[PDB]
Amino acid sequence: GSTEYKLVVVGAGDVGKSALTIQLIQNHFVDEYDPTIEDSYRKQVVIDGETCLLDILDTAGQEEYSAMRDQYMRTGEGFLCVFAINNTKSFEDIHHYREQIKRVKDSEDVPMVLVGNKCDLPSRTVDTKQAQDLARSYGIPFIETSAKTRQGVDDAFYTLVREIRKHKEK
């Protein structure tokens, strides 16, 4: 059978969670996606020879800390922590997402990838070194992406799958 990987895309509003997801799923860049639509999308993919079923949760809606919401988010096996490279606030929010994920997974060792999205844009306010340094602080990979050009998109999600595989071998 296919191994299913439950991947969760998190990050501040407008960083490109939906656009990254749709690029992975539909191979198309979406200029506009309703920011209140949270949905899960599936795609069968081959990663390192293995046929995988990716289940991608594109998070949306008001932040909510309830048992129900935590229970749901806790089903994620790996998390893309997305900021936009032209939005310093979205970068400064990353530790909040990291902290919430560690909380609901009750683990310091959750499969995670730091994603700096919108690298196609000229107006970057978060330089690569600071983002690499934050990923190093967390012990996780850092991948620069563009949902618009597809730069890094496969790498971001596939790296997350490889992280989950490695974690499950403990």
Ligand X SMILES: Nc1nc2c(ncn2[C@@H]2O[C@H](COP(=O)(O)OP(=O)(O)O)[C@@H](O)[C@H]2O)c(=O)[nH]1
Residues near ligand XV3, by CB under 6 A? 10, 13-14, 35, 59-61, 63-65, 69-70, 73, 93, 96-97, 100-101, 104
**Smallest gap, in angstroms, from Cβ of residue 50 to ligand X?**
28
Token pair belonging to 152: 């890094």
Segment near ligand X (CB under 6 A); pick from 13-21, 96-104, 106-114, 135-143: 13-21
CA-to-CA dists, residue 59 to 9, 26, 31, 134, angstroms: 6, 17, 18, 22
Token pair belonging to 4: 């299913």
Please give the helix or strand (H or E) that residue 31 lies within, else none. Answer: none
109 binding partner (options Mg ion, ligand X, ligand XV3, none; Cβ < 5 to 8 Å by kind): none
Q: Which of 146, 28, 31 is nearest to 85 (CA)?
A: 146
Strands 39-47 and 50-58, by their bridges, are antiparallel
Segment near ligand X (CB under 6 A); pick from 9-17, 63-71, 72-80, 92-100: 9-17
- CB-neighbour burial class of residue 43 (10 A; exposed 0-12, middle 13-18, buried 19+): middle
Size of the site for ligand X (CB under 6 A): 19
69 binding partner (options Mg ion, ligand X, ligand XV3, none; Cβ < 5 to 8 Å by kind): ligand XV3
Binding ligand X (rule: CB under 6 A), the pick from 15, 80, 94, 140 is 15
**57 contributes a contact to ligand X by CB under 6 A:** no
Provide the 10 A C-beta neighbour count for residue 124.
17
State the alpha helices, DSSP H only, in the chain: 17-26, 67-74, 88-92, 94-105, 128-138, 153-168
**17 contributes a contact to ligand X by CB under 6 A:** yes
Binding mask 61-100 for ligand X (x = CB under 6 A): ----------------------------------------
Binding mask 115-134 for ligand X (x = CB under 6 A): --xx-xx-------------
